[PDB]
mmCIF file of C-alpha atoms (C1' of nucleotides) in Angstrom:
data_model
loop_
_atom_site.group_PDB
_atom_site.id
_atom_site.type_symbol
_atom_site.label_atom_id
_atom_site.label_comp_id
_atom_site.label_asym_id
_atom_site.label_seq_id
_atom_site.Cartn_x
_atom_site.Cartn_y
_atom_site.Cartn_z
ATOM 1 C CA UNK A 1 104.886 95.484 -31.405
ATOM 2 C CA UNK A 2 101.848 92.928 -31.447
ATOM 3 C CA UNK A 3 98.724 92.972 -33.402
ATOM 4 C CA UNK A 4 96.650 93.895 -30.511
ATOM 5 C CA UNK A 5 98.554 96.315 -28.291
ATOM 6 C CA UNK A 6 100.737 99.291 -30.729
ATOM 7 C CA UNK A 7 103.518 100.776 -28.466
ATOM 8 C CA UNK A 8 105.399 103.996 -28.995
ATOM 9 C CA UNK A 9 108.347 105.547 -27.772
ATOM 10 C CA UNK A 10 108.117 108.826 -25.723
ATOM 11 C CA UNK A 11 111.309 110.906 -25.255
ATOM 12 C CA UNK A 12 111.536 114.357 -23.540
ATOM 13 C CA UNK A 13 114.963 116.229 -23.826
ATOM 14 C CA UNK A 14 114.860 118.837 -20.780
ATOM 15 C CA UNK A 15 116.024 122.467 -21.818
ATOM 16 C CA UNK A 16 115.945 123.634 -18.190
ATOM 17 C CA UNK A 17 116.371 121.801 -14.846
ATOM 18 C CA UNK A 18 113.788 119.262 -13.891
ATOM 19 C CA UNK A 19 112.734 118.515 -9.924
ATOM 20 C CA UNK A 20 110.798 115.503 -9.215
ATOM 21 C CA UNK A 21 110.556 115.724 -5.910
ATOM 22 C CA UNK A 22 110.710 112.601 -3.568
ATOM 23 C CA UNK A 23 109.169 114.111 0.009
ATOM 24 C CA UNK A 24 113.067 114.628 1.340
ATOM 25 C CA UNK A 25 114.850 117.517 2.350
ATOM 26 C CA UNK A 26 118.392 117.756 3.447
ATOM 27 C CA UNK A 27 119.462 119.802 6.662
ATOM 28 C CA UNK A 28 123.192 121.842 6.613
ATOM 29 C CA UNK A 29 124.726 119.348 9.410
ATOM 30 C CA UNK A 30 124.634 116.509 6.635
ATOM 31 C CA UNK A 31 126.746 118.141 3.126
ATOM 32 C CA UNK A 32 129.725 120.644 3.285
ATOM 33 C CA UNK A 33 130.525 122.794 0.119
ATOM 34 C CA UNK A 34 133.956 122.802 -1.242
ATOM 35 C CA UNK A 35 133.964 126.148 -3.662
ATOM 36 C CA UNK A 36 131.196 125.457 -5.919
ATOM 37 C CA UNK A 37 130.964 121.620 -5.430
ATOM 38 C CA UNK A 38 129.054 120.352 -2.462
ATOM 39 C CA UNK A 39 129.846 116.713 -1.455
ATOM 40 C CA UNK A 40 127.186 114.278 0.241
ATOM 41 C CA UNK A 41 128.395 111.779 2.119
ATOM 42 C CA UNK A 42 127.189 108.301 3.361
ATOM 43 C CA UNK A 43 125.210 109.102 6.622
ATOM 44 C CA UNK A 44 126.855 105.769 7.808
ATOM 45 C CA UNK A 45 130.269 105.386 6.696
ATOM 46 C CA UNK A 46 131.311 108.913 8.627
ATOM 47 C CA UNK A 47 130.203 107.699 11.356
ATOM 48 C CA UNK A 48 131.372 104.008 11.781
ATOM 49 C CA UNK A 49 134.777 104.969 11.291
ATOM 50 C CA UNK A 50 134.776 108.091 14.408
ATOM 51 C CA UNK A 51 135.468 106.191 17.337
ATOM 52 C "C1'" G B 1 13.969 -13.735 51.353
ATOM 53 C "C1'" A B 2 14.522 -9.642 54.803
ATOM 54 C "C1'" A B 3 20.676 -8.068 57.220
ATOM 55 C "C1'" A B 4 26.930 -7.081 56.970
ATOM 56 C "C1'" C B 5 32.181 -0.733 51.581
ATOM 57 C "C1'" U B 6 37.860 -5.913 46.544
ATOM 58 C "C1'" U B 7 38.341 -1.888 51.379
ATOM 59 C "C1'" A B 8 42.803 0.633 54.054
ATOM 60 C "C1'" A B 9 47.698 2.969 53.006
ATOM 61 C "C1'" A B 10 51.224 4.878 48.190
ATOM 62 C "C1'" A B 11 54.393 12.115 44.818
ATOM 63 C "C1'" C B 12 55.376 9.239 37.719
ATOM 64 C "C1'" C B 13 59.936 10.622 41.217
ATOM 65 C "C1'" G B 14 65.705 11.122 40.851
ATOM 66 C "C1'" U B 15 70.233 12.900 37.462
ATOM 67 C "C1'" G B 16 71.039 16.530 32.747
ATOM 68 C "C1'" U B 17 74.239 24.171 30.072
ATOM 69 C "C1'" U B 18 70.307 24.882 23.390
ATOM 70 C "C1'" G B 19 76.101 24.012 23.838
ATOM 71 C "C1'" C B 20 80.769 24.117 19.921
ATOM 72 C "C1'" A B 21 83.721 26.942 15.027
ATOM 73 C "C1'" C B 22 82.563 32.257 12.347
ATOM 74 C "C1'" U B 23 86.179 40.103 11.304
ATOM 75 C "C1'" G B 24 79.679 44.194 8.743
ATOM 76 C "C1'" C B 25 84.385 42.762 5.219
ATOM 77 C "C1'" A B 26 86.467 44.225 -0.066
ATOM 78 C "C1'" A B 27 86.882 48.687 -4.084
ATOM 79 C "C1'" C B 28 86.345 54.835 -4.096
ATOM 80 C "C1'" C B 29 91.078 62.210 -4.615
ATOM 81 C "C1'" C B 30 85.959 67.101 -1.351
ATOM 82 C "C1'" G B 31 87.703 67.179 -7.026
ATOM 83 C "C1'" G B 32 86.812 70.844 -11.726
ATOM 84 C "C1'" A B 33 86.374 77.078 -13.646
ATOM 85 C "C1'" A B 34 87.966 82.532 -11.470
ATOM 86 C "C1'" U B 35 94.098 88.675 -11.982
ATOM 87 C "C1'" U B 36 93.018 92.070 -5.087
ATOM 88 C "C1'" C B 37 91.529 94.599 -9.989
ATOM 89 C "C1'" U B 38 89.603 100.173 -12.158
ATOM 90 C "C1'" U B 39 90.615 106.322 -11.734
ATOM 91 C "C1'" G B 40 94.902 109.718 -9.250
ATOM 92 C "C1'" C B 41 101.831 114.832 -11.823
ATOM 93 C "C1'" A B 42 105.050 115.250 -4.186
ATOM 94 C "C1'" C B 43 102.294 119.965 -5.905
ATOM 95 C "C1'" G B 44 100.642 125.208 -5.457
ATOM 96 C "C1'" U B 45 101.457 130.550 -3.485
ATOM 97 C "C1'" C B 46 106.291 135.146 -3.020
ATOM 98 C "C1'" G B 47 106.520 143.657 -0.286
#
RNA sequence: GAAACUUAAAACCGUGUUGCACUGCAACCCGGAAUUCUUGCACGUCG
């Protein structure tokens, strides 16, 4: 600490699911499920490598 | 004694640099102080 400025330490355990969300939103022609799973891909890598 | 100009003519003139050498020069910070800072949940509503 310092004799001036007294910190603490704040720490939140979530007990449901937490969304923070970031102004982004993710169409269908981008991830493809596999059973429960759903896989998101590099944008970029799938296509450099399709001739 | 009464009567007849020591007069006439003649430039104080000719030639000649107020000229020769000489740095308005030497030394000197446009420098010292100053937060592009203060407030703000990527969120609300579901026959």
């Amino acid at each position: 600490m310092n004799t001036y400025l007294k910190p603490f330490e704040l720490t939140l355990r979530c007990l449901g699911p937490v969304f923070i969300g970031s102004g982004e939103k993710r169409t269908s022609k981008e991830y493809h499920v596999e059973g429960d799973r759903v896989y998101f891909p590099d944008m970029e890598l799938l296509y450099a490598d399709i001739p």
